[PDB]
Structures are given as C-alpha cells and as structure tokens.
Amino acid sequence: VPHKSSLPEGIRPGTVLRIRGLVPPNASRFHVNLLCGEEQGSDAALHFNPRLDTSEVVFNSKEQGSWGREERGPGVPFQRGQPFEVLIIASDDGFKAVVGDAQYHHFRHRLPLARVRLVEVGGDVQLDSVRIF
C-alpha cells in the first residue's frame, strides 16, 4: 500500500510522525519520504530507507532531482516477521528517528522544515497506521 498523508500547512518543531506496521517475511526494503510537493520528482527533505536485504538503514535528501550524501544508522532495527513502531520527530536542528523505545539516529535538516508538504510510506511493509501529531 503506497500511503500518502497530505500536510498543507507543513510541519514545525514538535511534530511527531508515528508509524506502526509489520515487516512481512521476505521483505527486502521500505521507505518513509517527507516530500516538498505532491508531484513526481519533488524534493525530499527526508528519505528514510530501512534495507532488510543489506541490513542497514540509509538516510538521504533529494534536491533538484539529485541525491545528497547518504547517512547510515547503526544496523537495521527491524526484523522480518516482526511488528515495529517508528517515531520521526521534528526538532529545530533535525529529525530524530526513534525505533521501539530507543533513539536510533538524528538526521540534521538539509531543506527547510517549512517546505515539507507530504509524507509517503511505501515498499515492502504492511502498515498498521500512520499518525501525525
């Protein structure tokens, strides 16, 4: 299910994205994108890409159709056949990624938080819910 949540007014420091779901057996990878528009090729303030097939999580941004330098977190905190809960929290200096009870990584802002207009979740994941507080 390619999930999309529209955020007309954008987000601000103090915004929390909570994503719950299940990593199916044989999943290769999935992603959570914070995009700056609803069209194809829109800039991505955040590309959060857990890769079960290569065992790592990649963070990146996309601007003018071109990717920035990837950041990687300490191992993959997801497992095939197991549910998970991810909190992506917007702060003044970056996005904190919390995976089930522990801070996993901090991704410093590359694009203005104010330009984020859409959240998309896709890939090999079976979503329970996506809530924005």
Ligand X SMILES: OC[C@H]1O[C@@H](O)[C@H](O)[C@@H](O)[C@H]1O
60 belongs to the binding site for ligand X (CB under 6 A): yes
73 marked as part of a ligand binding site: yes
In this structure, what token pair is assigned to residue 95?
A: 């996005």
* Contact map string, positions 55 to 94, toward its own copies, x by CB under 8 A: --------------------------------x-xxxxx-
* Contact map string, positions 40 to 59, toward ligand X, x by CB under 6 A: -------x-x--------x-
Q: Are 36 and 44 in contact (CB under 8 A)?
A: yes
Picking from 101, 71, 72, the residue whose alpha carbon sits closest to that of residue 84 is 101
> Which of 16, 122 has the CB closer to ligand X?
122
Q: Would you give the end-to-end CA distance of the chain in angstroms? A: 22
